[PDB]
């Protein structure tokens, strides 16, 4: 697919505003939801910020505290100088007058990690009130509101072209496919709508769907599009060409398989900002394991099928529930008792001594055990480590493999913060990590392919119901990063030529 199609480019173009003001009241106008958690918003929002000279030294403090938190620690002494000298002295020509006297002496002082982080709420705080106001009665405002309609316009699977065929396996086919408009290459998995039905798999889908919409994280495969067509159900979602973890351990260098001690870091700590974020929101993954953690083109990693997951309701601390893969199931859940985030962290241990080892840590290298003989091991047999791991990735995997849930690392006080402050990460920038700053230690070689692999029934009212539900449509965070990464904002979001 060397080449966008400009007859569905065509399709993309702003709308007259009449058609517009029926949007303009179903919708949130939330500042946090428009102009923060939507790149379109906040863009949007930033050049109507640009255009008027008061509200300029906001934008520029906004600005370099992002840049500031994004930098390299050689340049962050400077940056944090000149932030204070442009923006927190009284004569400076960009001082920000909003703020108050005790949080302009605060940002004043100190140099620690979270500097600035203060003084950001307090800039959002001000921006969301008055110049927030002054937006929504500005061109800038319409606009947005112009780009939301064309983001609501049907895009199914007239608008993807697949090129080839990436895995099949339960419930349906994964291929590699092109948005037609923009040119950009997504992942599309396909569930066959009668196997769906035979083997009732109507919830594990539609969790499933449900928890990568709402999630928005560079750490999780990212759900674009959901789309129903006469025999799939479709789920448009990031592709990650580098394949997973379970592949490079392996069958690259067979002879001393295994990653570096550094790399296994790296993709720990990337897994666990992604663990982080479904705790954070009450869901468990329930299936990590090298196999489910892929690679991107760059080299980060992401976790992916979500099938297994579960959501915890309000007010809800634990679940009960048998799933898994045998070698990565926690003994709490093996015995069959409730269970918490911990099940995760138990599979992050697994996780990574797999991967400094090449093999689990209940198994020698290819054994094959059945799940009885294997169940036993994980609740009795004591973990071994060979010479190859440090006194850190020992510490910490045995931390992680803790059979007691309790006395098992994890999440504490809603976030993963204790466990960054293991040894292990000491040479971790989790400030850059997150951001996607920082340069992955492996970049997989695109010449490379990394993989291996190669009735009826009348549907009811039901089902096409549940279809309809399921084809929720695009989701807007994603689509808008496709409009901007593809140079489609830009082009169509003009004023001047
Ligand atoms: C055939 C191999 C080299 C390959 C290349 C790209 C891939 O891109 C993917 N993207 C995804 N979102 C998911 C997923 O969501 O599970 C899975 C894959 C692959 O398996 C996958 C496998
Ligand atoms: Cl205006």
Same mark, same amino acid.
């Given at each position: %697919?060397?080449?966008?199609?400009?007859?569905?480019?065509?399709?993309?173009?702003? /709308?007259?505003?009449?058609? &517009?003001?029926?949007?303009?009241?179903?919708?949130?106008?939330?500042?946090?939801?428009? &102009?923060?958690?939507? /790149?379109?918003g906040k863009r949007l929002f930033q050049q109507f910020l640009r255009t008027h000279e008061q509200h300029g030294p906001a934008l520029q403090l906004w600005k370099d505290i992002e840049d500031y938190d994004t930098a390299d620690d050689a340049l962050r002494p400077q940056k944090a100088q000149a932030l204070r000298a442009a923006y927190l002295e009284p004569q400076a020509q960009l001082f920000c007058s909003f703020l108050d006297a005790e949080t302009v002496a605060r940002a004043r002082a100190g140099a620690g990690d979270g500097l600035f982080q203060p003084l950001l709420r307090a800039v959002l705080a001000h921006l969301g009130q008055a110049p927030f106001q002054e937006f929504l009665d500005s061109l800038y405002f319409l606009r947005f509101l112009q780009w939301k309609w064309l983001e609501a316009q049907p895009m199914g699977e007239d608008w993807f072209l697949d090129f080839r065929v990436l895995g099949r396996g339960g419930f349906g086919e994964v291929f590699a496919c092109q948005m037609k408009?923009?040119?950009?290459?997504?992942? &599309?998995?396909?569930? !066959?709508?009668?196997?769906?039905?035979?083997?009732?798999?109507?919830?594990?889908?539609?969790?499933?769907?449900?928890?990568?919409?709402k999630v928005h994280s560079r750490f999780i495969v990212s759900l674009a599009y959901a789309f129903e067509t006469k025999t799939d159900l479709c789920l448009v979602m990031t592709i990650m060409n580098g394949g997973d973890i379970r592949y490079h351990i392996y069958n @690259?260098?067979?002879? !001393? %398989?295994?990653?570096?001690? %550094?790399?296994?870091?790296?993709?720990?700590?990337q897994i666990v900002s992604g663990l982080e974020h479904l705790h954070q929101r009450n869901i468990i993954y329930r299936d990590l394991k090298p196999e489910n953690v892929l690679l991107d083109d760059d080299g980060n990693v992401r976790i992916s099928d979500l099938g297994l997951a579960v959501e915890l309701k309000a007010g809800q601390t634990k679940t009960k529930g048998y799933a898994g893969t045998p070698g990565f199931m926690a003994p709490e859940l093996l015995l069959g008792e409730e269970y918490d985030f911990s099940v995760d962290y138990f599979a992050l241990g697994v996780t990574l001594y797999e991967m400094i080892a090449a093999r689990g840590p209940f198994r020698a290298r290819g054994e094959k @055990?059945? !799940?009885?003989?294997?169940?036993?091991?994980?609740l009795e047999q004591a973990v071994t480590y060979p010479d190859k791991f440090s006194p850190a990735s020992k510490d910490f995997c045995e931390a992680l493999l803790q059979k007691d849930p309790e006395k098992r690392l994890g999440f504490r006080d809603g976030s993963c913060d204790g466990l960054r402050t293991h040894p292990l990460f000491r040479d971790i920038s989790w400030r850059q990590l997150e951001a996607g700053m920082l340069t992955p230690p492996f970049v997989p070689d695109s010449r490379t392919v990394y993989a291996k692999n190669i009735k009826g029934v009348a549907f009811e009212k039901a089902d096409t119901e549940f279809f309809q539900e399921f084809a929720s449509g695009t989701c807007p965070i994603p689509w808008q990063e496709e409009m901007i990464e593809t140079g489609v904002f830009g082009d169509l979001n003009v004023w001047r030529p």
């Open positions: %697919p060397a080449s966008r199609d400009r007859k569905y480019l065509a399709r993309l173009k702003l /709308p007259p505003l009449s058609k &517009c003001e029926a949007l303009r009241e179903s919708l949130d106008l939330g500042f946090e939801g428009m &102009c923060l958690e939507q /790149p379109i408009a923009t040119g950009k290459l997504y992942a &599309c998995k396909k569930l !066959n709508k009668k196997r769906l039905k035979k083997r009732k798999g109507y919830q594990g889908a539609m969790v499933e769907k449900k928890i990568l919409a @690259v260098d067979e002879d !001393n %398989p295994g990653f570096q001690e %550094p790399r296994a870091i790296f993709y720990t700590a @055990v059945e !799940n009885k003989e294997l169940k036993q091991r994980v």
